């Protein structure tokens, strides 16, 4: 007896028999104690079935072709005629046998399991129709957020793990657009625009929206202001219309916190300018009523005010002491330019006696203090 004539083949086993004289290989299913003919051959002994368990996948290497009734077609001979050089992905299943040609491309590898606050960046490699009836194109992009299960398909591939960055109270997270996208607010944004999100707590992005940089908030103390500037053409979020170049100053007024816009420029921190009852200051180049410094001009302060330093403004001789006089005390005065007290021309002289709570003009100037008169 050369060959093995009956073989018994256990549950879940499969045998390939080969038919000599007309090369029809096909596989024998098991349980089942086969007897083999004069005209076959077994291939090898039974071996087991690939079972796929729940929650696993395999790829099957050269398919068996199948019909709208998902049975295996036969070829012209009784040939079990197989899609050659392409993949199929099977999921969980009854555990079925290989067919003559069909090779395990990949042994039961897990699902992959997408966590909570993480998402799949997923997009289309070629045309296909999805689970709902949506036709999706080659160059599509999409997410697929946790906590789930992802079924891989050959139409789709995985290009990274998103994972959502938390935003604490005092930040805000900078994104940049990839692509023409909606923001989760509802507005509209083009490629490479970027903005800031204000929300507090877990946020995951977008498909087109790129994480960038976490913004902290400058916290303003009531002897702080924040010195800005535009860095291009945008309407802030108070309300209030900017344009480039332009320098503001924002106060505790404003806001508690102020977290630097993507078309804001921060230059610095300036300190409050605080004054007392007898205490008054002069400014160089004070900004006018249209937003711009008059270079050359002057302007005095007093009579305790607390103010921040506009952008481009400079004190003269920083905090200076109110002309305090006694019945005894004088002062002598010069006009620097025509003054209006009697009218003064050009270069006029005259003394002021006390007792008077004094604060020279910007017009006129302090030549001497006079003691005792």
């Given at each position: 007896a050369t060959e093995e004539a009956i073989i018994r083949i256990p549950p879940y086993h499969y045998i390939h028999?080969?038919?000599?004289?007309?090369?029809?290989?096909?596989?024998?299913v098991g349980p089942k104690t086969y007897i083999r003919q004069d005209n076959e051959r077994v291939l090898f002994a039974p071996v087991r079935m690939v079972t796929v368990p729940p929650r696993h996948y395999c790829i099957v290497a050269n398919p068996?072709?199948?019909?709208?009734?998902?049975?295996?077609?036969?070829?012209?001979?009784?040939?079990?005629?197989?899609?050659?050089?392409?993949?199929?992905?099977?999921?969980?299943?009854?555990?079925?046998?290989?067919?003559?040609?069909?090779?395990?491309?990949?042994?039961?590898?897990?699902?992959q399991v997408?966590?909570?606050?993480?998402?799949?960046?997923?997009?289309?490699?070629?045309?296909?129709?999805?689970?709902?009836?949506?036709?999706?194109?080659?160059?599509?992009?999409?997410?697929?957020?946790?906590?789930?299960?992802?079924?891989?398909?050959?139409?789709?591939?995985?290009?990274?793990?998103?994972?959502?960055?938390?935003?604490?109270?005092?930040?805000?997270?900078?994104?940049?657009?990839?692509?023409?996208?909606?923001?989760?607010?509802?507005?509209?944004?083009?490629?490479?625009?970027?903005?800031?999100?204000?929300?507090?707590?877990?946020?995951?992005?977008?498909?087109?929206?790129?994480?960038?940089?976490?913004?902290?908030?400058?916290?303003?103390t009531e002897k702080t202001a924040l010195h800005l500037r535009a860095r291009q053409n945008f309407k802030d979020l108070r309300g209030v219309a900017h344009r480039t170049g332009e320098e503001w100053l924002v106060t505790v007024q404003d806001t508690e916190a102020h977290v630097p816009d993507v078309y804001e420029e921060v230059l610095g921190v300036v300190p409050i300018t605080t004054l007392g009852p007898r205490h008054y200051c002069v400014i160089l180049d004070p900004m006018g009523p249209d937003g711009k410094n008059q270079l050359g001009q002057k302007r005095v302060v007093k009579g305790e005010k607390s103010f921040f330093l506009q952008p481009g403004e400079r004190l003269e001789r920083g905090i200076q002491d109110v002309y305090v006089l006694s019945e005894q005390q004088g002062l002598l005065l010069k006009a620097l330019q025509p003054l209006e007290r009697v009218a003064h021309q050009a270069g006029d002289r005259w003394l002021i006696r006390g007792p008077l709570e004094y604060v020279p003009s910007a017009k006129v100037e302090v030549v001497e203090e006079r003691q005792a008169i």
């Amino acid at each position: 007896a050369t060959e093995e004539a009956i073989i018994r083949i256990p549950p879940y086993h499969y045998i390939h028999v080969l038919d000599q004289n007309s090369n029809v290989s096909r596989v024998e299913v098991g349980p089942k104690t086969y007897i083999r003919q004069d005209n076959e051959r077994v291939l090898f002994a039974p071996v087991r079935m690939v079972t796929v368990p729940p929650r696993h996948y395999c790829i099957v290497a050269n398919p068996v072709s199948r019909d709208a009734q998902s049975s295996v077609l036969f070829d012209v001979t009784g040939q079990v005629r197989l899609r050659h050089a392409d993949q199929e992905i099977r999921l969980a299943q009854d555990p079925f046998p290989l067919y003559p040609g069909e090779l395990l491309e990949k042994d039961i590898t897990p699902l992959q399991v997408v966590l909570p606050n993480t998402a799949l960046h997923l997009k289309a490699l070629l045309d296909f129709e999805d689970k709902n009836g949506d036709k999706v194109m080659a160059g599509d992009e999409w997410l697929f957020e946790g906590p789930g299960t992802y079924i891989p398909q050959k139409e789709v591939e995985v290009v990274e793990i998103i994972q959502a960055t938390v935003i604490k109270q005092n930040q805000a997270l900078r994104l940049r657009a990839r692509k023409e996208c909606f923001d989760r607010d509802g507005k509209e944004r083009v490629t490479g625009e970027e903005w800031l999100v204000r929300s507090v707590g877990a946020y995951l992005p977008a498909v087109f929206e790129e994480v960038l940089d976490l913004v902290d908030a400058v916290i303003l103390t009531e002897k702080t202001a924040l010195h800005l500037r535009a860095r291009q053409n945008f309407k802030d979020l108070r309300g209030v219309a900017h344009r480039t170049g332009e320098e503001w100053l924002v106060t505790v007024q404003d806001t508690e916190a102020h977290v630097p816009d993507v078309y804001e420029e921060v230059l610095g921190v300036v300190p409050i300018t605080t004054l007392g009852p007898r205490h008054y200051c002069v400014i160089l180049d004070p900004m006018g009523p249209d937003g711009k410094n008059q270079l050359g001009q002057k302007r005095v302060v007093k009579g305790e005010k607390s103010f921040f330093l506009q952008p481009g403004e400079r004190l003269e001789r920083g905090i200076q002491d109110v002309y305090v006089l006694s019945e005894q005390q004088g002062l002598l005065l010069k006009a620097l330019q025509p003054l209006e007290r009697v009218a003064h021309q050009a270069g006029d002289r005259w003394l002021i006696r006390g007792p008077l709570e004094y604060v020279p003009s910007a017009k006129v100037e302090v030549v001497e203090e006079r003691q005792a008169i």
